[PDB]
Symmetry: D2
């Protein structure tokens, strides 16, 4: 398969597997085997030996996501968090420093601030939407600039190409967590990022039924260290999960186009309502970084955050008033979800500059019919009065 000559929807179905030369099954077989027979000691039959070191069903997934990012290399992990931990352990050692943003998944922040600081790593938080702030925070020991764009949950936007330029003449690498945009909307390697991280739990799987992570790169050395760590630390996905993830990925383009259609309409409806003080959606002209988003994103995504004029009580009542959109953690599935980040996904950021306003609700707009989602949002807003 050649990624450079085929479209995204084509690649999402065909980049990882073609019907094999044995039976020719249309889909990758599920190789639920921990081991593989060898033809003689350490002479492998067809490249595989032990599933923690490699399995074809997992490699199919890896190759697919790599192709969708414009990447030669990809490696999969048991979760987005485990992928982040492995990338941290490759890039950093005691005495090194990270530049991190001021709006970010609470789990990323918790890992740095609770775990990696106990192992000798330093960090600085900055507003990554201000290129000069990032530039000022880079020290001689900075090995990593960690960017999420759009950020979770406020949907803040960073200019990837501009921040990548800052790493020239330095030993810093730029890693973009591309979970919210997905590879369908944004390809950070093409703008100068060194590596890209995904939680495949979210949009790539798309069906809220498999936890997973994945790292992609064009750096063969980085691919070798990801493989070394995949096998040597062992946070590897199940073959069943890697099959389910890849299955979901086959509909990413059609899903995301509907998520973005729906979110544009719900954001416009929220922006007309006096219960709402602020709609956070990258496609709105006044959203901070809108012009950066429109240059680097194909569309503006399925996520919306909303700040309520009636404060935390209104935010929480909105959370318990919806009847189609479900109150739950996570995002990026076909079903619509909502949550209150200050008490739920980002309770771990309390006390830090990443702490989220208590009047804020984060909504993952699914692929249900827009008329039904508009009706549910409207009735929930009317339940506040």
């Amino acid at each position: 398969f050649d990624p450079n000559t085929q479209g995204f929807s084509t690649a999402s179905i065909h980049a990882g597997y073609e019907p094999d030369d044995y039976y020719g099954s249309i889909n990758t077989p599920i190789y639920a085997s921990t081991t593989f027979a060898q033809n003689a000691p350490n002479e492998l039959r067809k490249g595989y030996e032990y599933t923690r070191v490699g399995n074809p069903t997992i490699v199919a997934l890896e190759q697919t996501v790599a192709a969708l990012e414009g990447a030669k290399y990809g490696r999969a992990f048991s979760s987005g968090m485990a992928a982040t931990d492995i990338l941290f352990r490759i890039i950093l050692k005691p005495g090194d420093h990270i530049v991190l943003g001021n709006d970010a998944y609470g789990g990323t922040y918790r890992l740095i601030d609770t775990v990696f600081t106990a192992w000798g790593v330093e960090y600085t938080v900055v507003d990554t939407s201000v290129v000069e702030e990032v530039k000022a925070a880079i020290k001689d020991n900075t090995k990593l600039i960690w960017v999420e764009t759009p950020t979770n949950p406020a949907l803040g936007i960073t200019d990837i190409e501009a921040v990548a330029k800052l790493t020239e003449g330095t030993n810093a690498k730029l890693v973009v967590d591309n979970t919210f945009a997905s590879p369908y909307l944004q390809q950070p390697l093409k703008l100068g990022a060194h590596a890209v991280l995904h939680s495949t739990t979210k949009y790539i799987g798309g069906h809220s039924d498999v936890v997973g992570g994945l790292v992609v790169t064009n750096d063969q050395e980085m691919d070798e260290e990801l493989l070394f760590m995949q096998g040597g630390i062992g946070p590897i996905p199940s073959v069943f999960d890697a099959y389910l993830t890849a299955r979901g990925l086959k509909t990413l383009a059609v899903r995301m186009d509907r998520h973005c259609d729906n979110a544009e309409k719900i954001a416009e409806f929220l922006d007309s309502r006096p219960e709402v003080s602020t709609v956070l959606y990258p496609g709105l002209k006044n959203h901070p970084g809108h012009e950066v988003a429109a240059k680097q994103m194909k569309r503006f995504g399925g996520m919306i955050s909303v700040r309520f004029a009636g404060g935390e009580e209104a935010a929480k009542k909105f959370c318990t008033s919806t009847k189609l959109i479900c109150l739950a953690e996570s995002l990026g599935g076909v079903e619509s979800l909502l949550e209150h980040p200050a008490t739920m996904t980002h309770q771990s950021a309390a006390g830090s500059q990443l702490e989220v306003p208590r009047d804020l609700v984060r909504i993952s707009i699914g692929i249900e019919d827009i008329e039904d989602l508009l009706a549910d949002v409207e009735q929930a807003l009317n339940n506040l009065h």
Copy 2:
């Protein structure tokens, strides 16, 4: 379910799940969901929120293995290696020291020696079968004594109770990797170990189809830190894998009794043959530590290692001559396997005191009929001449 009043086979089926109060399915449902609806923000319906932080199908497995070890607490991970890495990160920090044995899974050693030494951890290798050697190696900064018994691949034996006594008056914890014995043959917590590790990839799953790890303890603080890390680093098992693992575990006693029946007979047959210089099997009277094994193990296991009088060429030819026993990595499945550790599972120990003799073959004796396994071993031995 009460573990203290029921037998091992009973617990292996019933300690993790009883038919629920909703539908009453005989087996734990497979909760292939990343998230769970809440009744209000951060008010959970029945204890679950997000699968990386907890899922009922995974907790069923955890509770089952905990009960089989005489443990109050258990936590599952994506692999034996990932479980080891998490336990290392809980117990150690920069500046701390580990005492490790001289025969051990090459992956354990690689993790310490390549990764943890780069993060400021020190270690010392000793022969853990010599209690005085362990005692001498404990320093004021020793936080961990890591014991495997029987060891992989030489089946060396450590006196768990004796080594546990060494940790009194110290800040060292004893962790036993109980993979080879399984909880059916040996219960290190009852002899004073602080925690127990398993690769469930091996005997606990038993069917060579799921990679997994698990840690058990009676220390509630340790359970809290395992949970924190499970969720915060995220090397969590798939729900499908945790179901398959627990499914396999339901036959552990009946499997292991057949593995041990078969291995006793194959070890006796090997001990009569002049092609063999040494049979390594804990149940043989001259195996080093046999008397220690007979005190702390119910039976002597399914693993045998063999050293060939004709050296490496004979070891490798034996590997390619068997027709029922398969040449492959791994162990503890219903099918019989064999491998050459110096070139395969322990190639990573080359150069170290853990390096394995090149004349050594490690055999995982399965549950096939003994007459057929004896016939296969006999014909393979006759192929050397």
Copy 3:
């Protein structure tokens, strides 16, 4: 959930399952259990006893497809064929008669003609696109008129409402095999059909990884007999397959809209090429029954058949020349497929009026990028010269 007030995409995600009142998982749990504990003899805990008689994971699927058809009742089976066999056995007995069309899945025809005629059932084949031909073939013993529209493989069109009117004053029931249109494009119960059949193997699952069938109706007596036969003959789906099918169904609308976008463009391109004698696609103005299709179908589907001016040799060479579209049986998956019906899916119709022209290729247009599918078709057409 109320189907009558929510949209198709909403229903496809939410009509079968809402997060339960036990744990609240976002998705239906996989109840991989053959049996369920009872509270006393034949006093069920929550409606379930034995999976062949009923399982919640299967009922979730059933309820979802029923809602998408405007049906109160649905029952699932191991395959489209097994669903057809069960419906035949309910509606017919020895001495009864069926009216069948002249273009139909070869397996339907084989079942009638090889099996049911040996059990005393009679049939007549007619062109169901000619309402008067159907009317003339109805006898006093006719219990079933079996309609496929569009037909497999020629995409012939039947006026469902008109044929349903013919059953007034008779003991005949109209059953529509709605596999090719799916419930997203066509709802035969709303036009007077008595029951609707699907092979969920095709579009409803959508991922070419699960074989299944399903029958929907508004007749409660028919639902009772489908249940009786589901449990009493036992062609029941696996719980894993019913979960996978329902998972796929969550993207039916977004998939089908892309399949129809793509097929409209490929049909137009084929209609411009002199290698092609006839393009069979319901959306073309000259396709027989186009006006009937436009009244009863929302869009015209993802399937195209093509007859080649160079006869069978050209049809077969086209089959082996495509490099993205794969030569294989089946249809309705995200990947594009093609086949030669005379030698493959319809070889069983040889000798009958259903026999398919040897110059005919049937194409299942997937959801790949149109530019890549156009390029593949164009290069394959150029390989004929």
Copy 4:
């Protein structure tokens, strides 16, 4: 693999699959694909085309069970009932007759008596333990003698060889439903049966998590008709279920030996108690047909039925008093179950000669520790007083 030279436990692991010549996975891959690429129209790559007509994962299972029965041929189905229905449809036509026993699975009886009699088939019920009664019931139109031994639920015993001799000079075939004995305890083809049926739902799977059926034979014509019907009627198993079934089958010998150990001890304990009027267990010297069972069965099985001196009230109270043995339908899993057949599995036999005494409880003795099962039975018996 050669079945004739290897033992049962060997075959149960190795008769269906050997590590392939492509990747060499230790276990059969799960081919979750409905279709397979062809090299040209109707030129298959490696024997497979469409999963309803054949799939390698299903064929692995089929070949395994065939080998365990001493059979050249095997074909799998979605349930035991669907397998029975297919075998009925092959062997019988309108006007033919069946000889059936007087104690039999209620579902078998329901299928004959409700469905097949409506299609022109006749039957006669006899006591199949009386060879002369079977002989007398054979007519010129008899095509099938259907034997279960031991019977469900009374554990009645039929002399297979003797009944097979009755079919000489006739057009009758003997089919044995070998579900309760399993192939580990009894091999009816070796005693003259024409075909053997299993519900793999029970012992062969062994884990109460997969519904399935299977038919084995040495008649190649019968294998061709089973294949024809498998594909043409389509009651085919899921690939996931066929993998799970075969996984379970790998421990059949070790499971069954423990089930039989346990059942012998529970039957002896029940036979000492005055609450019990009759213990039905084939290994008891006074059980009718004990001497026949000891000739044709390796051991006497895991099932026990019990008739209570205090009648139906005592039978039902025993059912609700056990705390380890669970009240549920089904049998042959690792967990112990019990049920009241008159109200549960055999309510469908009410009114017929197959109707089961209301004082009768059927117990599926699992593989839990005997001390715990004895304790549970003893306490439940003491709850009657």
